[PDB]
Swiss-Prot record, chains A, B:
UniProt cross-references to HAMAP family, sorted A to Z: DapE (MF_01690)
Domain of life: Bacteria
Cofactor(s) listed: Zn(2+); Co(2+)
Active site: D69, E134
Function: Catalyzes the hydrolysis of N-succinyl-L,L-diaminopimelic acid (SDAP), forming succinate and LL-2,6-diaminopimelate (DAP), an intermediate involved in the bacterial biosynthesis of lysine and meso-diaminopimelic acid, an essential component of bacterial cell walls.
Gene: dapE
Alphabetized GO MF terms: acetylornithine deacetylase activity; cobalt ion binding; succinyl-diaminopimelate desuccinylase activity; zinc ion binding
Coiled coil (UniProt feature): none
Record keywords: Amino-acid biosynthesis, Cobalt, Diaminopimelate biosynthesis, Hydrolase, Lysine biosynthesis, Metal-binding, Zinc
Record's protein name: Succinyl-diaminopimelate desuccinylase
Amino acid sequence: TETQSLELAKELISRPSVTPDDRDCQKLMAERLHKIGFAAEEMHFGNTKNIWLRRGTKAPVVCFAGHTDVVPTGPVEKWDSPPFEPAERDGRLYGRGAADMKTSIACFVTACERFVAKHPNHQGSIALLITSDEEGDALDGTTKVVDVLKARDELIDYCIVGEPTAVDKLGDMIKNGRRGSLSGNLTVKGKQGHIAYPHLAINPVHTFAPALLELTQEVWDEGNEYFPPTSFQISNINGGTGATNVIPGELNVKFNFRFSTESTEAGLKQRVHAILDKHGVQYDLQWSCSGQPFLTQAGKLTDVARAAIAETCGIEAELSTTGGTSDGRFIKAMAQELIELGPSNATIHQINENVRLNDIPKLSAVYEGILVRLL
Amino acid sequence: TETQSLELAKELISRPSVTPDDRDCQKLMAERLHKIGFAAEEMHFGNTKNIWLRRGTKAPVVCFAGHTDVVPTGPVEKWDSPPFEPAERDGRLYGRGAADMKTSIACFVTACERFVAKHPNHQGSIALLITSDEEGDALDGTTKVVDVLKARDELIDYCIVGEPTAVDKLGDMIKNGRRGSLSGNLTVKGKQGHIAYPHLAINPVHTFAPALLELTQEVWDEGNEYFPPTSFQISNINGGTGATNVIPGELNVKFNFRFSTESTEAGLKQRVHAILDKHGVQYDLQWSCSGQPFLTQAGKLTDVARAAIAETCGIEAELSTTGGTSDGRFIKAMAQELIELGPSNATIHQINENVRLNDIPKLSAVYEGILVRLL
């Protein structure tokens, strides 16, 4: 029941590191870890601060990955306590970054201390890959670091990204991958005209209708052991001039797939075109893909995380690929196995974000249990 | 062949009577007709000028209705000839109002003069119900005149509204009624959420899909002898915040029915509600009805129009209720029989609006022919 993770958490949370402002969080980490054998390599691009902290030179290399930036607080007066002034209240630690994801960072730093003190002659290496831009556009954050490391063949064996992954109780869920994302920008073509002369126009809302129903009722795949079924959702739909006596000449539809390994990017695009073409829809369709699904199947890393959780929290962790994504999508290209493990994500990016106080030392203890098992 | 209709047409066309500015067209008309015994009763409401011109005091009363206002010309340099400077070119008269509907007004004025000169002791009465606001909101135009006339029981037996009704050849089509118009502003309720967590949101585009298909495929009625089938058209559809990773919380749909006498306003509203309810759609739905269908079935007026057209143009006129509407929607309440008859409506409200020169004299001749058969 150490109290150090909690204190480092507060210190980090007291820095208003709204993306992409690091606020010297990385400087503080680099100095603290330097005391126990961690070397620091700064990799700054544009206005983003990135840093590779590493102790040791041989495999197996265990890497904790995370970001020091936090999303904007919104109107400060709507919070019950200043977002950048860490407050303990009702068994919780409140502040922006309390859940996403400064508590995790603090928890791994202290785990590194207790582990290194207890095991000075441990094999392999320990690294931290930290960015000040995971929440924004992230063009200059983690992705650039992975490129440098992959370019000089400095690879990772096991990577734990500290994003908040718990549903409720700490350790109830660990992420072992994420769905890919494929977006379409569809412009259905009709022919504008006066509503009273329908035969002289082509209503793109009516020509799209049968394809819209088939798309929304389609079952893309069955999902599998690690992923839920591929999900199709329409985010926007807009047609018309605002005039209620006009038939629009075109209709714009924006949609997205969060797809699993059961389908491919190509297969899904082919199926959408096949549904629009069989209903005779006339259109332009632009596609964009922000990433493919990535997965670490059950192996040593998931087994050690489950074992460490069982010991520290007394519960059986479930593996999941649901939700959004993280910098794990960049790092998986350079890490043989990668999981995400952190506290509850229920309040991320909301006012009064918080983490249970008792989950704090347990999270650091889990991380420490993972280093023991891998090193 | 007379050339007086053409000259009056041009005189009228040269006045830039953009709604609701009459530009003295009614004064020119009232002075001209006063010479042949038409008394004038001005009925100005707000910024709209209206006038009841009438010769005679007994039934049957034959009324020519029309509007002196024209729609805006748009940028003047896009026209081949100045919109307010009537020009003869390639067997056509060009100018704003040449088709809608100053030529018709000029043609009925000259028809009255020839008829009164030929038939000084004609039975019944001739009246002209003219407004300077038919093309705009029309709140203070023909509707106010009708109310005044109906209130003192000064009714019409046969009314001819001079709107352009021809498809191509003058006299090929006459309108004997118009469809009603019933509009709906539908707001489908869902629950906004992040696209990556579909189970925590309700996509209104997906919930509306099955009802949208059913509404667009529905056959409302069969049409009948005088009307085409009731027509349903969606004019606008808008949902989304513009973010492609968000599931919208609501969807707005604007639609309209141009309905015949085979359906009722109540019946159509009941059916839309029943389709939305059977698919479990959650929503708010506001209705607006700008008018019911109106119709003059085959009788003396349609027979006389057809006979006059056959004598003058050598063709068989078709009866129709298609297209938009006119001030006949207000006048039918006070006129036992009402039809619309004018030149080609191909170019109304368009740049380079025009009417065929030879169609001018023929149209005046048809109107005169109708006067002869009714009076």
